[PDB]
Design a protein around this ligand. Structure first.
Ligand code: CLA
Ligand code: CLA
Ligand code: CLA
Ligand code: CLA
Ligand code: CLA
Ligand code: CLA
Ligand code: CLA
Ligand SMILES: CC1=C(/C=C/C(C)=C/C=C/C(C)=C/C=C/C=C(C)/C=C/C=C(C)/C=C/C2=C(C)CCCC2(C)C)C(C)(C)CCC1
Ligand SMILES: CC1=C(/C=C/C(C)=C/C=C\C(C)=C\C=C\C=C(C)/C=C/C=C(C)/C=C/C2=C(C)CCCC2(C)C)C(C)(C)CCC1
Ligand SMILES: CCCCCCCCCCCCO[C@H]1O[C@H](CO)[C@@H](O[C@H]2O[C@H](CO)[C@@H](O)[C@H](O)[C@H]2O)[C@H](O)[C@H]1O
Ligand SMILES: CCCCCCCCCCCCO[C@H]1O[C@H](CO)[C@@H](O[C@H]2O[C@H](CO)[C@@H](O)[C@H](O)[C@H]2O)[C@H](O)[C@H]1O
Ligand SMILES: CC1=C(C/C=C(\C)CCC[C@H](C)CCC[C@@H](C)CCCC(C)C)C(=O)c2ccccc2C1=O
Lengths: 98, 730, 166, 176, 154, 42
């Protein structure tokens, strides 16, 4: 309704944390944060380091073929509309069954 | 019932729990009944056994509607006056792009309202007043503001005649069930005395006040407001005070005249309406008939007369009833009223009757599709209500042994044919297209069906169209061109931005749409015909008429025993017609723009909104989304942030509402029950439900909420798709 | 199946505790008030004390006081479910052991009693509301300004003010 | 065959009507005595002398406090005792109903004969003008619109217009 | 601050949005009301979306790219009342929709037969019940958990 | 004329004088503050 109302602004979009946050834990790398008690280092992991995660599971941000692509308000909806699927689909299968 | 009968309560009943069928709404609570009762608020099984009133009710309901139109359209005519667009447009027509209607600016609203105008922000309109309107000559905004209240006058009064029936102590049988006059009157002096009366205010006043408008001025530089009587100098131009004739007749001389008239044929140049002057003559030449005609007569007389050997005994006393069925004398009507509306839809686009139409593209195709859905929405009805006859209306049998009793005699027969008719069509009427794909995608054009490839070779030309204009070999006299400009012979020349009107020559690729229509018109009707015919008793059920034209479905047995009935034949018959019309629309605009709707340019090189893409490319039924749906519609999905935008912004909803119908159309019923309780449970724990037993939808209500949505969904989708590809280029 | 007027020990206690603390809070202002002296949220760090030590953050003074506050506070929740306070002054209040009339359930209006003395704290109740809904006002009027009254030759008129921002 | 109004809050509607109309009383005499302006002439300074004005709105709060209490307390008791719950006398609560509101409490009561009444004697004074006042006010309040509208000058607003010949007012008279 | 670029104080991409768009809706060179008294793009509809300005409030407000605002709503920095402030508000209002739902309902089932009172509605909105809802302090929030609706009523 | 313990009735859709209106007064708060998306407080 907003758009084509020609205010694009006054659009309502959530830039949807919860994922971006997962994938700090992993990383990298888009512009930092510390995230209190990681901090982008200092506390690094320390117990673990050069062994295991190396260069791997470090594409980081990487537009071309990262693994992890950089999620925003467009993805905070489909991701709630795949969620309204297996739920409705299952209230009917759960029910169907029960 | 008895709150309290007869004689001794004025005192009205509001309260104690209320009414229908005798184990009347229970007392004890339910939901369905709230859905019952809007539905089947009138059926007339119930209220009384005896027709008694109802004809005494249906006259009143009729009054309400006539008022209401009136409430309407005062509104319209308002709106049209005092949010003017109109004064501005008329000096200005063919520049203007016209509104009656404006929002107020609250929240988003106002993207909507984008400069239309003689300098004001608007929502552009495609029903034309402003074209009904041209006719008023006198002009100015405050009047239409009189024509407006003149509207609200007719209303209140043509709405206190509805008090002045049923509610007032009111009328009895003879008055309808002696018919004997009724068309006598109606057609004679109203059908007549309107068209007649319309003549008198269609040359008196209108002709002159656009005879010298078709030049310019700033109106009233031309027309005084009353100006037009004992007077008249002005008639003198536009012709004589009859100078010396007498009451027509002849011992009359013209060395140069013949009275206003003088027939037009073809279109005005610089207002291509068609001449404003055959418009008096034609209406005059109508009325007479009606004036003479509504002078029959009193009845069985004519109907009881001619009989034949196939032909029907029944034909005779083809219905004592007819006077009192009603449901039948409505069903007949709808077929006509209905089938007599979409005959408008042609004579309109191929012969405009208002100044500035065609040039005005979008403000007469809206029309040709609105008028088009009524000459269809009223026809399936015209079957439903016959089904409503075929089942119930008369107490008893005594129709007997006729013409009908005849038709039924065969019935697994009239519909036995009609069936094959359709599969003959369909195979010759759609897989025809599918050839093309399967073989143009295989790709070998040598052998398609293209207007070029499979040989008729390059003429359409001679059938009727070519005999029709070409018209004066004839006992025909008249008028430089055609009855309709489009017919093949004649003319480059029509109009001033733009093309209005030109041959349209067809060939093939007008050939086969014209045939899909056949098959679509036919299998529509199969289902309604067989539906209304097998109304009451069937080879699958005999005990079939017993509650219902409605009942859901008789029961799981006999194999299926579901759809049957005839509410449902008038449920699956709508389902088709939505196509019948939905694809006829799809036909006209793809033509009317692929060819015709135009532009003129120096040396008149015509530039069709699409250089005839139709040619080789409707024949492919993908071309129908290559060239249509994906081509045009790019204006619907570009329409954001604009002024019309409310179309693109609808086109998602209603392109949603449709894709919600299937849920109502495709689903069980004790399902949403089985669900509605899980609900009802959670409800009781908190203590929040039981009272008014919440119930799922009434098998057939569910079908009522299919269909109805499937249509107001699937339909306004294009109402949007359209107004969005004529506003703006085209 | 039982119809009405349940509540009991219940939250008569809650309100009165509001009244008693509201009264105290107001006393926490009170202070400047005649020698106009000090103002408003202050955020004080309270009275001081006089200095050898601080600079003053000096830890979270509140967190600690408040852990202690916390098993006085339990003591009271306790009492209220099953009662022992020698004085026994909210639950009924003093005059004590009775309130029997509440204890076995179901009173519906009851007025109450208290103290070996007399004058039934119906007069402390008032002094006590006013202080309820007196914070109410007091807190409200910050958002804008500190001070009330005294004098007009100019002050009383409220000739020009801020509003809310919109 | 005719509506049934009778409507039943109702008897209340008539006492609401007294409020409107007796109040309507204040207006007429005083404004109009009007000072038959006036001998001459009228100055406010005095309070509001220069105190940054007097009332504005604040005047309206005081007006209302004084009133709230009154309009409020009020109908609250024109009458109404018994005051609870389950089943109907109909007034609409009806609670006062049988019990007046009290058997034995007090003198709630006024006057002789187990009753509210001042008693029989008088419609007299005040049914005819006070209700005649129902009438009076309405026409004379209907007179107020007549008296300002047309705003001589200042404001046409939105014209389709089409007056003048001449202005409108009250001083009194009528021309013509 | 959290990724989507920062507030009003600078969001160029946001700036460019302010400007083109509206300012062009302007860019109909004129269309004429040189006196004229009606047509209101001119005044506000722009200016009401436009005297939106290096101010908006200020509001923080995140502005992703294309400088449309993103709402984090974390409990941080600036952003707290983009969910809670209008969140408890949603809660409070609802629940005083249905606290009275569970009220102009639990008041009947009673006396002499009540089989469809419900479709006419003495007193409308219950009203009487209505205000119960603002005069919930706590209300259901203990009474639902104890007594009345009580586990037994469970 | 209405005192204590529920009152008089009302029709089928007085909800159409409750959707229209009440709710209607709310555009009336959505132009007083012609806008939202967070909100200052009082
Ligand atoms: C019942 C829930 C519904 C469902 C099925 C989901 C599902 C999902 N959400 Mg989600 N979400 C919801 C409601 C829901 N959400 C609501 C109401 C909000 C606040 C608007 C959010 C805000 C949100 C964010 C920021 C993100 C997700 C994300 C996700 C996805 C990753 C896992 C996750 O973070 O879960 C989210 C789990 C919760 C929010 C727990 C609460 C579950 C509901 C049922 C409780 C209702 C609480 C009430 C409405 C709010 C309290 C009141 C207020 C005072 C706080 C997952 C598909 C992430 C994602 O991957 O996006 C791509 C992440 O970006 N959600
Ligand atoms: C000139 C004729 C006209 C008249 C006078 C009647 C009269 C009648 N018809 Mg009928 N009918 C007609 C044309 C007419 N019909 C047509 C053209 C059709 C084909 C569609 C039908 C199909 C039809 C059926 C199937 C039935 C009737 C029935 C009836 C009877 C029941 C009336 C009722 O309760 O209203 C019914 C109206 C409603 C309950 C209102 C609901 C309307 C919904 C669907 C809205 C429509 C969509 C619209 C866009 C929504 C508004 C906008 C919104 C989005 C804001 C009555 C005697 C019924 C009967 O049982 O006979 C006794 C039977 O149901 N008719
Ligand atoms: C998603 C969840 C969960 C899972 C499945 C794992 C799984 C793992 N973690 Mg891990 N981790 C988690 C949460 C989890 N972690 C959290 C919340 C923290 C923060 C305290 C860590 C901090 C952590 C460290 C420091 C390390 C691991 C490491 C590891 C890996 C090897 C452990 C081992 O040697 O035995 C293993 C893949 C080790 C590793 O192999 O990484 C290089 C080591 O580096 N984790
Ligand atoms: C045919 C239909 C009908 C319809 C659909 C409308 C629709 C409309 N009228 Mg309207 N009107 C009508 C009959 C109608 N009118 C009639 C019969 C009259 C004469 C009494 C009017 C006199 C009228 C006025 C004076 C106004 C409208 C206005 C409007 C618009 C304001 C919306 C509204 O009414 O609620 C909200 C809306 C587009 C308003 C408008 O045009 O401003 C935007 C204006 O207020 N109408
Ligand atoms: C039913 C129709 C309608 C109506 C109400 C009128 C009414 C009138 N016409 Mg008229 N007129 C009409 C259709 C109508 N006309 C048509 C269709 C034509 C052309 C085919 C004319 C051609 C016409 C002419 C030439 C004149 C009138 C005049 C008049 C006026 C007086 C004479 C008369 O006709 O009747 C009343 C009967 C007698 C006076 C005898 C009267 C106002 C005349 C006039 O101006 O006033 C005298 C005269 O100028 N009409
Ligand atoms: C079943 C009945 C009875 C019979 C046996 C017929 C037979 C016929 N009618 Mg007929 N008719 C009847 C009752 C009957 N009619 C009745 C009751 C009516 C009034 C409803 C008519 C109205 C009627 C018309 C208008 C026509 C016929 C025609 C015909 C003839 C068809 C032409 C033909 O085959 O030669 C053609 C053979 C060639 C070799 C050439 C055929 C002889 C048609 C006719 O006149 O003959 C062409 C004409 O179309 N009938
Ligand atoms: C003689 C005692 C003294 C007194 C007067 C009280 C009094 C009280 N205690 Mg308590 N308490 C005491 C010693 C005392 N306590 C000691 C020494 C401990 C060491 C664990 C506790 C641990 C304790 C806990 C954990 C709690 C209380 C609670 C309470 C209050 C509720 C009554 C209750 O829960 O009894 C219990 C009733 C019984 C019938 C005991 C059941 C016996 C077993 C065998 C079953 C009440 C004011 C409760 C409270 O007020 O919560 C806010 C609860 O928190 N007390
Ligand atoms: C006795 C007398 C008389 C009478 C008068 C009158 C009363 C008249 C009239 C006139 C008339 C009586 C007219 C009418 C007309 C009508 C018409 C003209 C119709 C119409 C309509 C319409 C327009 C519609 C349309 C439509 C359609 C198409 C369908 C649906 C839709 C609508 C509605 C749109 C005379 C004169 C002799 C004079 C002497 C005395
Ligand atoms: C959250 C919420 C909500 C929701 C909303 C939504 C989400 C919506 C939607 C909607 C959609 C998503 C869709 C819809 C659509 C509708 C429609 C659509 C209606 C109507 C219509 C019309 C008026 C039409 C007309 C016409 C005609 C005349 C005939 C045919 C054509 C047309 C269709 C044009 C509300 C606020 C509500 C409530 C509260 C909560
Ligand atoms: C679209 C595919 C073409 C297939 C049909 C072609 C057959 C007929 C020839 C062209 C049809 C268009 O008809 C058009 O002819 C001329 C364009 O050359 C134009 O010719 C017009 O312009 C000039 C101005 O005085 C003069 O040459 C003519 O007197 C006049 O009629 C006209 O605007 C129109 O009458
Ligand atoms: C706490 C548990 C939940 C409560 C819900 C259950 C409510 C109890 C229902 C009442 C059970 C049956 O009680 C039944 O017997 C009464 C007398 O014997 C009858 O009462 C009737 O007879 C009396 C004889 O003078 C009359 O004065 C009463 O006006 C009349 O109602 C009724 O028929 C009914 O009230
Ligand atoms: C989805 C579906 C349902 C379930 C649909 C239901 C239950 C729709 C009825 C919902 C009603 C309209 C909700 C009414 C509640 C509100 C009007 C009450 C509050 C009033 C307001 C102020 C909101 C059927 O019952 C059904 C029956 C037969 C074939 C197919 C289907 C089918 O597909």
């Amino acid at each position: 309704v907003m758009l084509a109302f020609g205010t694009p602004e006054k659009q309502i979009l959530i830039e949807p944390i919860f994922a971006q946050w997962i994938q700090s834990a992993h990383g990298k790398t888009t512009y930092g944060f510390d995230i209190p008690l990681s901090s982008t280092n200092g506390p690094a992991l320390n117990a673990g380091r050069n062994i295991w995660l190396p260069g791997w599971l470090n594409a980081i941000n990487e537009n071309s073929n990262s693994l992890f692509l950089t999620i925003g308000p467009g993805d905070f909806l489909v991701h709630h509309a795949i969620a309204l699927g297996l739920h409705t689909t299952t209230l009917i299968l759960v029910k169907g069954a029960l | 019932l008895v709150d309290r009968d007869p004689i001794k309560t004025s005192f009205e009943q509001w309260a104690k729990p209320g009414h229908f069928s005798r184990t009347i709404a229970k007392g004890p609570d339910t939901t369905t009944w709230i859905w019952n009762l809007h539905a089947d608020a009138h059926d007339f099984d119930s209220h009384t056994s005896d027709l008694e009133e109802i004809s005494r009710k249906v006259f009143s309901a009729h009054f309400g509607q006539l008022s209401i139109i009136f409430l309407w359209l005062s509104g319209m005519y308002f709106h049209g006056a005092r949010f003017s667009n109109y004064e501005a447009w008329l000096n200005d027509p063919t520049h203007i792009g016209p509104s009656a209607q404006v929002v107020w600016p609250i929240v988003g609203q106002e993207i909507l309202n984008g400069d239309v105008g003689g300098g004001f922000r608007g929502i552009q309109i495609t029903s034309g007043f402003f074209q009904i309107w041209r006719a008023s000559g006198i002009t100015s905004e405050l009047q239409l503001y009189c024509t407006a209240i003149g509207a609200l006058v007719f209303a209140g009064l043509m709405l206190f005649a509805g008090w002045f029936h049923y509610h007032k102590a009111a009328p009895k049988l003879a008055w309808f069930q002696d018919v004997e006059s009724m068309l006598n009157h109606h057609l004679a002096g109203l059908l007549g005395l309107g068209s007649l009366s319309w003549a008198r205010h269609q040359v008196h006043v209108s002709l002159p006040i656009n005879q010298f408008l078709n030049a310019g001025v700033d109106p009233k530089e031309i027309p005084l407001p009353h100006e037009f009587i004992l007077n008249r100098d002005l008639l003198a131009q536009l012709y004589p005070s009859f100078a010396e004739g007498a009451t027509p007749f002849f011992t009359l001389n013209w060395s140069k005249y013949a009275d206003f008239l003088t027939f037009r044929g073809g279109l005005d140049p610089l207002t291509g309406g068609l001449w404003l002057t055959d418009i008096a003559h034609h209406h005059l030449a109508i009325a007479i008939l009606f004036l003479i005609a509504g002078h029959m007569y009193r009845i069985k007389d004519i109907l009881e007369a001619h009989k034949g050997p196939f032909t029907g005994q029944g034909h005779k006393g083809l219905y004592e009833i007819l006077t009192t069925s009603w449901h039948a004398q409505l069903s007949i009507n709808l077929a006509m009223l209905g089938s007599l509306t979409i005959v408008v839809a042609q004579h309109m686009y191929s012969m405009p009757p208002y100044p500035y139409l065609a040039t005005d593209y979008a403000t007469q195709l809206s029309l040709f599709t609105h008028h088009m859905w009524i000459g269809g929405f009223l026809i399936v009805g015209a079957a439903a209500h016959a089904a409503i006859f075929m089942v119930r209306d008369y107490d008893p049998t005594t129709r007997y042994n006729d013409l009908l009793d005849r038709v039924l005699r065969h019935r697994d027969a009239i519909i036995s044919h009609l069936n094959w008719v359709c599969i003959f069509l369909g195979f010759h009427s759609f897989g025809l297209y599918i050839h093309n794909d399967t073989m143009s995608a295989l790709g070998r054009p040598q052998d398609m069906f293209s207007d070029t490839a499979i040989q008729l070779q390059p003429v359409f030309a001679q059938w009727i169209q070519n005999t029709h204009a070409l018209a004066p070999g004839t006992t025909a006299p008249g008028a430089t061109a055609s009855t309709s400009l489009t017919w093949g012979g004649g003319d480059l020349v029509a109009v001033g931005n733009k093309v209005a009107l030109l041959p349209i020559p067809l060939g093939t690729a007008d050939f086969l749409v014209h045939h899909i229509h056949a098959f679509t018109i036919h299998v529509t009707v199969l289902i309604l015909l067989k539906g209304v015919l097998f109304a009451r008793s069937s080879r699958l059920i005999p005990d079939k008429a017993n509650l219902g034209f409605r009942f859901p479905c008789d029961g799981p047995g006999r194999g299926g025993t579901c759809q049957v009935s005839a509410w449902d034949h008038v449920f699956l018959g709508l389902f088709w017609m939505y196509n019948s019309i939905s694809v006829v629309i799809f036909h006209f605009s793809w033509k009317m723009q692929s060819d015709v709707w135009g532009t003129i340019n120096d040396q008149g090189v015509v530039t069709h909104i699409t250089a005839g893409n139709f040619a080789q490319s409707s024949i492919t039924i993908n071309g129908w989304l290559r060239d249509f749906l994906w081509a045009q519609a790019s204006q619907v999905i570009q329409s954001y942030g604009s002024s019309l935008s409310a179309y693109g912004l609808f086109f998602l909803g209603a392109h949603f509402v449709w894709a919600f119908s299937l849920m109502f159309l495709f689903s069980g019923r004790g399902y949403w029950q089985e669900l509605i309780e899980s609900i009802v449970w959670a409800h009781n724990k908190l203590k929040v439900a039981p009272a008014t037993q919440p119930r799922a939808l009434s098998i057939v209500q569910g079908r009522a909420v299919g269909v109805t949505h499937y249509l107001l969904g699937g339909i306004a989708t294009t109402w949007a798709f359209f107004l969005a590809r004529i506003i703006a280029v085209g | 199946l039982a119809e009405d007027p349940e509540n009991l020990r219940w939250f008569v206690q809650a309100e009165l505790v509001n009244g008693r603390w509201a009264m105290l809070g107001v006393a926490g202002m009170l202070l400047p008030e005649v020698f106009t002296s000090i103002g408003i949220i202050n955020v004080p760090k309270w009275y001081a004390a006089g200095k050898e030590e601080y600079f003053a953050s000096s830890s979270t003074l509140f967190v600690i006081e408040f852990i202690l506050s916390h098993y006085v506070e339990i003591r009271r929740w306790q009492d209220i479910k099953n009662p022992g306070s020698v004085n026994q002054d909210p639950i009924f209040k003093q005059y004590s052991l009775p309130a029997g009339e509440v204890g076995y359930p179901g009173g519906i209006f009851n007025p109450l009693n208290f103290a070996p003395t007399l004058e039934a704290k119906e007069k402390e109740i008032a002094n006590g509301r006013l202080m309820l809904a007196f914070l109410g006002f007091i807190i409200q009027h910050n958002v804008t300004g500190k001070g009330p009254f005294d004098n007009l030759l100019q002050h009383i008129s409220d000739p020009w003010h801020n509003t809310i921002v919109q | 065959s005719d509506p049934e109004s009778l409507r039943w809050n109702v008897q209340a509607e008539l006492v609401h009507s007294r409020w409107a109309m007796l109040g309507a009383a204040g207006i007429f005499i005083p404004e109009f005595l009007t000072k038959l302006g006036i001998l001459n002439t009228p100055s406010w300074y005095t309070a509001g002398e220069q105190e940054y004005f007097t009332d504005t709105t604040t005047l309206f709060i005081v007006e209302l406090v004084f009133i709230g209490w009154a309009e409020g307390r009020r109908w609250a008791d024109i009458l109404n005792p018994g005051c609870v719950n389950t089943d109907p006398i109909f007034p609409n609560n009806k609670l006062t109903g049988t019990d007046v509101g009290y058997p034995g409490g007090l003198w709630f009561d006024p006057l002789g004969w187990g009753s509210a009444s001042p008693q029989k004697l008088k419609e007299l004074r005040t049914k005819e003008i006070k209700n005649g006042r129902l009438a009076m006010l309405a026409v004379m309040g209907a007179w107020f619109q007549h008296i300002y509208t047309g705003t001589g000058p200042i404001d046409n607003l939105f014209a389709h217009l089409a007056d003048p010949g001449h202005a409108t007012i009250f001083a009194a008279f009528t021309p013509k | 601050d959290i990724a989507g670029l920062t507030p009003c104080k600078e969001s160029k991409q946001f700036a460019k949005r302010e400007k083109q768009a509206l300012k062009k809706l302007q860019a109909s060179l004129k269309l004429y009301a040189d006196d004229s008294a009606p047509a209101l793009a001119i005044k506000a509809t722009m200016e009401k979306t436009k005297k939106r300005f290096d101010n908006y409030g200020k509001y923080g407000l995140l502005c992703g790219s294309d400088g449309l605002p993103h709402l984090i709503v974390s409990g941080d920095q600036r952003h707290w009342g983009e969910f809670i402030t209008p969140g408890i508000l949603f809660l409070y209002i609802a629940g005083w929709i249905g606290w009275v739902g569970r009220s102009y309902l639990i008041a009947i089932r009673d006396e002499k037969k009540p089989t469809q009172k419900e479709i006419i509605i003495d007193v409308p909105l219950a009203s009487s019940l209505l205000f119960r809802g603002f005069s919930w302090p706590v209300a259901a929030y203990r009474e639902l958990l104890n007594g009345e609706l009580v586990d037994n009523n469970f | 004329m209405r005192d204590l313990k529920t009152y008089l009735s009302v029709a089928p859709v007085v909800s159409t004088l409750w959707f229209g209106a009440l709710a209607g007064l709310l555009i009336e708060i959505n132009r007083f503050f012609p806008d939202a998306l967070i909100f200052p407080f009082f």
